[PDB]
């Protein structure tokens, strides 16, 4: 959070191109960087829009942005961290260790079915934008989830209806 | 099934546009209508490519597109015997009628889930396209239950993993 306003609304006036006042998801996801020259997760930066977006208008405004940005800044940070041999891409044992340290109790074979799922290079290490992605589906499915665990052990018994509207929820 | 090979190949050579003998998932979107006057929803295009294509060549050649033609028609089929008032959108009523007639014991307020999920109009009327997504996504998953579903019953136990490594599909 240490930046001026005076420095984020210059950030502000820079990505926002058409002068609208509003940040739409296009000009979000031009001002974002995944580290490997392909256009940010568009996925991604409208899961961030919407966020952040309160007063319904597919976009952010000056005060809203403040709170994108920091919110990229938090994620970019956590990325650092646990990109351990320091390549730009999480890989498997980096995002056992990031998951891990978010609080994930999950076996081992699992997390190659999360990286086959998010990443979009497919080359089973994970840019920036689809561990934001990655990360964003697990807390949404964790609560979810959560809704129909009472007891919260990690179990749960669901009729075939129950579970259809489970896997659309998302 | 009715037509003859020299109908389907003149098909084929119209739709195969840069003419490599394979249709792409481009070409194909290009041949299908929604009847919506917007874009064949692309990823059922995706979905009834690669269920038609076995050399993995992301595409279909001419014994295989015949496949693609005759699975469009019998969907077509489909379509309008349960789009009954003849709008050609289905509505919640007559999506009812279809899944039902599928075999599909579902409650009435599923149907609204499903209709958001798969309309990308938004006025509540699913297209041919969204209506052949909607399906292929439900027999897709009833599939993934039923591995899981031992006895049929229609109820499962399923931990917090299992659940996500399934949600994942
Ligand atoms: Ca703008
Ligand atoms: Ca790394
Ligand atoms: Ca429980
Ligand atoms: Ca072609
Ligand atoms: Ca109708
Ligand atoms: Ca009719
Ligand atoms: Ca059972």
Redesign the pocket.
Known sequence: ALPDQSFLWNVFQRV?????????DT?LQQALSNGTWTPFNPVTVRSIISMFDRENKA?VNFSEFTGVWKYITDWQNVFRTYDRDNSGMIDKNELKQALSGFGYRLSDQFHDILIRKFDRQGRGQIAFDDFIQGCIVLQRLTDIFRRYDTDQDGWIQVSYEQYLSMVFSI
Do not use: A, H, L
């Open positions: 926002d191109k058409d002068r609208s006042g509003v940040i739409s000009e976009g």
